Design an enzyme around this catalytic site. Sequence first.
Site, PDB file in Angstrom:
ATOM      1  N   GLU A 299      78.095  46.843   9.146  1.00 34.93           N
ATOM      2  CA  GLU A 299      77.634  46.314  10.422  1.00 34.93           C
ATOM      3  C   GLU A 299      76.112  46.355  10.528  1.00 34.93           C
ATOM      4  O   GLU A 299      75.494  45.395  11.009  1.00 34.93           O
ATOM      5  CB  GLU A 299      78.258  47.101  11.572  1.00 34.93           C
ATOM      6  CG  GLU A 299      79.752  46.896  11.774  1.00 34.93           C
ATOM      7  CD  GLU A 299      80.092  45.533  12.346  1.00 34.93           C
ATOM      8  OE1 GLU A 299      79.174  44.797  12.768  1.00 34.93           O
ATOM      9  OE2 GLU A 299      81.285  45.186  12.353  1.00 34.93           O
TER      10      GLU A 299
ATOM     11  N   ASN B 170      74.646  36.821  19.279  1.00 34.95           N
ATOM     12  CA  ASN B 170      75.876  36.063  19.124  1.00 34.95           C
ATOM     13  C   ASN B 170      75.729  34.682  19.745  1.00 34.95           C
ATOM     14  O   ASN B 170      74.866  34.438  20.594  1.00 34.95           O
ATOM     15  CB  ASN B 170      77.050  36.789  19.781  1.00 34.95           C
ATOM     16  CG  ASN B 170      77.259  38.163  19.216  1.00 34.95           C
ATOM     17  OD1 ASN B 170      77.217  38.352  18.006  1.00 34.95           O
ATOM     18  ND2 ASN B 170      77.465  39.139  20.087  1.00 34.95           N
TER      19      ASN B 170
ATOM     20  N   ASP C 285      77.417  33.134  21.950  1.00 39.64           N
ATOM     21  CA  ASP C 285      77.608  33.019  23.391  1.00 39.64           C
ATOM     22  C   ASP C 285      76.471  33.643  24.196  1.00 39.64           C
ATOM     23  O   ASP C 285      76.560  33.682  25.429  1.00 39.64           O
ATOM     24  CB  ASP C 285      78.945  33.644  23.798  1.00 39.64           C
ATOM     25  CG  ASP C 285      78.992  35.132  23.560  1.00 39.64           C
ATOM     26  OD1 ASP C 285      78.002  35.705  23.074  1.00 39.64           O
ATOM     27  OD2 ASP C 285      80.029  35.743  23.866  1.00 39.64           O
TER      28      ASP C 285
ATOM     29  N   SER D 180      75.383  36.822  23.939  1.00 43.03           N
ATOM     30  CA  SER D 180      75.428  38.267  23.926  1.00 43.03           C
ATOM     31  C   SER D 180      74.736  38.778  22.667  1.00 43.03           C
ATOM     32  O   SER D 180      74.399  38.015  21.760  1.00 43.03           O
ATOM     33  CB  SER D 180      76.870  38.754  24.004  1.00 43.03           C
ATOM     34  OG  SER D 180      77.632  38.277  22.906  1.00 43.03           O
TER      35      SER D 180
ATOM     36  N   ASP E 245      74.502  42.246  19.786  1.00 40.24           N
ATOM     37  CA  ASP E 245      75.096  43.441  19.196  1.00 40.24           C
ATOM     38  C   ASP E 245      74.002  44.453  18.870  1.00 40.24           C
ATOM     39  O   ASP E 245      72.964  44.084  18.312  1.00 40.24           O
ATOM     40  CB  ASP E 245      75.852  43.112  17.907  1.00 40.24           C
ATOM     41  CG  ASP E 245      77.061  42.234  18.129  1.00 40.24           C
ATOM     42  OD1 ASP E 245      77.590  42.165  19.250  1.00 40.24           O
ATOM     43  OD2 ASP E 245      77.507  41.622  17.144  1.00 40.24           O
TER      44      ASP E 245
ATOM     45  N   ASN F  59      78.674  45.336  21.388  1.00 36.77           N
ATOM     46  CA  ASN F  59      78.397  44.033  21.992  1.00 36.77           C
ATOM     47  C   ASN F  59      78.129  44.143  23.489  1.00 36.77           C
ATOM     48  O   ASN F  59      78.907  44.751  24.224  1.00 36.77           O
ATOM     49  CB  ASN F  59      79.607  43.128  21.735  1.00 36.77           C
ATOM     50  CG  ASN F  59      79.331  41.677  21.992  1.00 36.77           C
ATOM     51  OD1 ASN F  59      78.415  41.329  22.721  1.00 36.77           O
ATOM     52  ND2 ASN F  59      80.138  40.811  21.392  1.00 36.77           N
TER      53      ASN F  59
ATOM     54  N   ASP G 245      90.947  51.182  23.005  1.00 38.74           N
ATOM     55  CA  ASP G 245      91.309  50.159  23.977  1.00 38.74           C
ATOM     56  C   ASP G 245      92.495  49.306  23.541  1.00 38.74           C
ATOM     57  O   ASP G 245      92.788  48.300  24.198  1.00 38.74           O
ATOM     58  CB  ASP G 245      90.100  49.269  24.284  1.00 38.74           C
ATOM     59  CG  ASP G 245      89.848  48.221  23.224  1.00 38.74           C
ATOM     60  OD1 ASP G 245      90.571  48.186  22.206  1.00 38.74           O
ATOM     61  OD2 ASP G 245      88.906  47.424  23.416  1.00 38.74           O
TER      62      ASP G 245
END
Length: 129
Positions: free
Chosen positions: A35, A46, A48, A50, A52, A59, A101
């Site tokens: 990562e 990203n 959209d 956003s 990281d 994110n 989650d």
Amino acid sequence: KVFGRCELAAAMKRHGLDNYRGYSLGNWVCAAKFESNFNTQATNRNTDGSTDYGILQINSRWWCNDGRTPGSRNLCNIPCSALLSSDITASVNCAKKIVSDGNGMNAWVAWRNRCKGTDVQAWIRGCRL
Ligand SMILES: [Cl-]
Ligand SMILES: [Cl-]
Ligand SMILES: [Cl-]
Ligand SMILES: [Cl-]
Ligand SMILES: [Cl-]
Ligand code: NA
């Protein structure tokens, strides 16, 4: 800060990630390698809008606030900049919430594509833990 492999393994162990939700330490070290290349200051944008952040590339669409991701959530209740610190505590505590989650470590695309189903124990081989 750019961590060494065994340095990061030991820090992640001290913070309770070894076998957290059943994921052995090598999974977490492998994810961080692919990562961020073990670099706490890593950022990537990203499509959209956003971004990281940090050693585990968390994110801003869901997990932290950076003031520039409209309509997003802040489920770890932190500014995203706190995930870039040389102290990995904030990144680890947020990652614990993520992996709990329901989708496990599949949330990390690099883990799913480069670590899942491999001999991840090799990532902690030789380390004094
Ligand atoms: Cl390495
Ligand atoms: Cl392991
Ligand atoms: Cl925002
Ligand atoms: Cl620490
Ligand atoms: Cl799981
Ligand atoms: Na956000």
